[PDB]
Design an enzyme around this catalytic site. Sequence first.
Site, short mmCIF file in Angstrom:
data_model
loop_
_atom_site.label_atom_id
_atom_site.label_comp_id
_atom_site.label_asym_id
_atom_site.label_seq_id
_atom_site.Cartn_x
_atom_site.Cartn_y
_atom_site.Cartn_z
N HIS A 53 -6.26 3.76 39.64
CA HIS A 53 -5.11 4.04 38.77
C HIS A 53 -3.82 4.02 39.58
O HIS A 53 -3.08 5.03 39.63
CB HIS A 53 -5.29 5.37 38.03
CG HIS A 53 -6.53 5.41 37.19
ND1 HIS A 53 -7.79 5.58 37.74
CD2 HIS A 53 -6.72 5.26 35.86
CE1 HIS A 53 -8.69 5.56 36.78
NE2 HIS A 53 -8.07 5.37 35.63
N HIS A 186 -8.76 6.49 24.05
CA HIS A 186 -7.63 7.32 24.38
C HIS A 186 -6.39 6.49 24.70
O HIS A 186 -6.47 5.30 25.04
CB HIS A 186 -7.97 8.25 25.55
CG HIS A 186 -7.98 7.57 26.88
ND1 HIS A 186 -8.93 6.63 27.22
CD2 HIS A 186 -7.17 7.70 27.95
CE1 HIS A 186 -8.70 6.21 28.45
NE2 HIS A 186 -7.64 6.84 28.92
FE LIG Z 1 -9.11 4.25 34.28
#
Ligand SMILES: [Fe+2]
Lengths: 407, 405
Positions: A53, A186
Amino acid sequence: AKIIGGFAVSHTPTIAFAHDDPVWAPIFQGFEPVKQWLAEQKPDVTFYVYNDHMTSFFEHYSHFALGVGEEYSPADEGGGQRDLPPIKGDPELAKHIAECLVADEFDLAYWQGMGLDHGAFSPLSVLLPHEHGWPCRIVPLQCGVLQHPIPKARRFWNFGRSLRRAIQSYPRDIKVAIAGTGGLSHQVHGERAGFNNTEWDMEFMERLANDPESLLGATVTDLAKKGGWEGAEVVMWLLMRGALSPEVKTLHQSYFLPSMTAIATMLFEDQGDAAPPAESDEALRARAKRELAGVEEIEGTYPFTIDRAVKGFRINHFLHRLIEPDFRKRFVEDPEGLFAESDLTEEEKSLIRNRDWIGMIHYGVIFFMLEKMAAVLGIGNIDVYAAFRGLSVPEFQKTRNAAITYS
Amino acid sequence: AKIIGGFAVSHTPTIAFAHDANKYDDPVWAPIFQGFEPVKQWLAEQKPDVTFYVYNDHMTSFFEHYSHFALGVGEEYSPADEGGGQRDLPPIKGDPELAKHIAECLVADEFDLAYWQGMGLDHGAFSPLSVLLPHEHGWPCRIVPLQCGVLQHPIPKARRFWNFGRSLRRAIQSYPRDIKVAIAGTGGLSHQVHGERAGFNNTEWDMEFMERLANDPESLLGATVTDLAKKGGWEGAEVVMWLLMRGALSPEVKTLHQSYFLPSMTAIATMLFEDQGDAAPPAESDEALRARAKRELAGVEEIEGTYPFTIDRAVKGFRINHFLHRLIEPDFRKRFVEDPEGLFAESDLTEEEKSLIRNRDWIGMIHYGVIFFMLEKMAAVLGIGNIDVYAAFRGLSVPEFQKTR
Ligand SMILES: [Fe+2]
Ligand SMILES: O=C(O)c1cc(O)c(O)c(O)c1
Ligand SMILES: [Fe+2]
C-alpha cells in the site's frame, strides 16, 4: 512440487494495530480453522499474493513483483517497525517460478531487501505462530493494483493458472500453500468512503469457489462499483484461486463486517487435477530452461541469474551506493568506518579492499557496480577489463583496434 | 498518431565520454561522430515531437527493485549519478499523456508493465542522446523512456520484445493527437564487459544481425539468450531492444543509414529507418483500439466521490505523494512534527500542496491527487487516527460518522 491448497484472507492494518471483546472475538475464530490447517499441513513454503500500500513500492511501481531474496523484515509503515522476526524467503523456488512465468509470456519484476508492510504481516501474524521464527518460508508476489492501468482480471486469473503448474513442475517434492490476500467490499477514499456491499461479497465468494471463470469478464468498473474502489483488489483472489484445482471444496468460509472492511476468509482444499496436464512437468522444466540451455559452454562468462543476485545482493547493494556522493566520499577517506558499519562479511570486505576485480565477478558482483567503483577510484573501465584478462593495460589495449580510456 | 521512423544506436559510455571531452577533433573519434550525423540531421529536419526511447539502465536507478518493461510516465528526466556525479545536461521533458495512452493500450494487450518517475537516466539514455540532439539548455523534443530489464535473467523472450513493439505501434498510431513520434532502440552491438571473456567482439555477427533486423526481423524471434551471447557477447544480448523498436515500425522500412565502428570494447553502430506507413488498414481500427483501451474504466465517471488513481493523477500527485512517502524515514518522521515549516521550506512543493497538508484537508488532498495510503501514513504519524479521516471524507464528525453497524 505439490500444492496443498490456498487461503483467501483480508489484509488490514486494524487486525495488526489491536491484536498486537464483544466485537473482535467472533472473527478471530472465523480465522482459526487454519492456524489449525497451516499447522497440521505445516506448508514448506507459502506463495503469498498481496499488495504493497505504497510503502515499499511507489516511485517505481510494478504489476507482478516477485520476491526473490533470503529474508523479509517488517516495513516501517510510518508507525515505526513492528516488532516481528524476519521471515525467511525461498530464492530457488522464486527463481524457478520466474522461469516458468517469463517462458509463458508473463512480464515480472524481481525485488530484494525491501520491507513487507501490513499487506503481508497483518494477516500473517494471526495465521502463523511467530514467536521466534515463522513456521514456513515465503515467496511474496507483490501485485500492482493501486495505480491504473493494471492487469485485467483475466490476466490475473491466467497468471495463477501458470503459477500453479510452475509450482507443480518444481523438482523438489515439497508442499506449498497459496495465499491471495486482500478484500473485500470496501472503499477508503472519497465521498464514497465507507461504502460496503454484502450482496456482492456473498455472490463473489460462492462464485469464486464454485464458478470463478464467471468473474473473468469483470472490468475495474463493475468491481469498483459492486465493492468499493479499493475492494476491486480482489483481483488477487482470482490469482490465488487460479493456481488451485478447477473443482475444489471450501472446508471453511467465514465473514464479518466490523469497522472498515468486509473481513472474510475462504479456505480451499486442493483436489487432484482435472486430468493430466497438457505438457509434461519435465517438458515444462525443459521449456523454462530453454533460453539459457548450454550457456555453460560459454567461457569467462558469469550469467547474472536470480541465484547470483541473491548471493551478490549485499556486496552489490553496498557498491550500488557509490551513486550517493556522500557514501562514495567516505569510501575514499574512511573505508574502514564504512566497512565496520556495513553488513558485509569479511571476504566481501577483502575483495573490495584488495580491488580484486576478477574475484568479485566470480563471487557475484555485477560488472556495473565495478564500473562505478573504478570510476570512484579515478581508474577507468580499461584497467578493470585488463585485470579481468590477467593482462597489463598496455598488453590489453594491443588487443583493441585503438587505445582510448574513459570513466 | 504519426510514426515517422526509428533509429538504433549504441549507448556505450565512451560516446558520452568522447563528447564531454570534445574529441570531435582527434584521429580516433572523428569518424565515429561522423557516423552519427545522418541520424543527427534526420532528427533536426523531421522534428519529431516525441522520441519513444527504448534503453537499458546499468544497475543505477534500477537495482534492488527491477522490472522488465518499465515505462517512464513522469514529466522530466535529469541525468543520473554514476559514482562521478550527474553530467552537465538539461533535464529532458517527458510526455505523461502519451505515456498514459500507451500504458492503457499495452495492458489491454496483456502486457504487464511498470510505471516510474522522479528517477535519473544513466548512460543508457544520455550517452547517445547527448550526441544525437543539440542541448545548450533545451532538448529539441520530448521523450517517453522505456527502460528494459535486460540484465537479471530470466528476462522476456526475444519474441516477447518483438511483440511489444508490435502493440506499441498500434498504440502510438492510435493516439488522438497530431504529433510526430520517432522510435529509438539503444544498446549493442557485439561486446562483453565481464569475466575472462571481456573484450569479445564478433563483427561478422553484428553485420548479419543488422541486415536481418532491417530486412527480415521475424527471422530473429527464435533467438535465445545463449545464441545471442555466444554470438555477440553477454552484454551484446541487449540487442533484443533493437527488436522491440523494429517491432513498432512498418513491416518494410527504408534503411536510410548504417555505420559501424569498433575502437575498443563496443561495436559502436547506428541505423536510421524511415517508416513506410501501413500498406493495408489493420485488423483493429484506431477507434476500436481506443475503445478497447479505456474499456475497463469505461463509465467510471458516474461513480460518486470516486477519484481513480490513474497515471495523470499520479503525475499530478508526484511531488506531494513523494513528500508524504518519506514519512517512513524516522528522521523525516519527526521534523514533519517538530519543524513542518523547515521541512516545507526545504521541499519542492507548491504553496498549495503545503496548505492542503497544514490544514489536514483530508478530502481536499484526495481531489488534489493524493492517494489515500499516503494519508494513512500522514494521519498515524501526526497522532490523528484514521477514524477522523474517513469521516472528514464525508463531512461527518468523528462521533456522527461511526453510525454504521
Ligand atoms: Fe490492499
Ligand atoms: O566499456 C564499454 O565500451 C561499455 C561500458 C558499458 O558500461 C556499457 O553498458 C557498454 O555498452 C559498453
Ligand atoms: Fe546497456
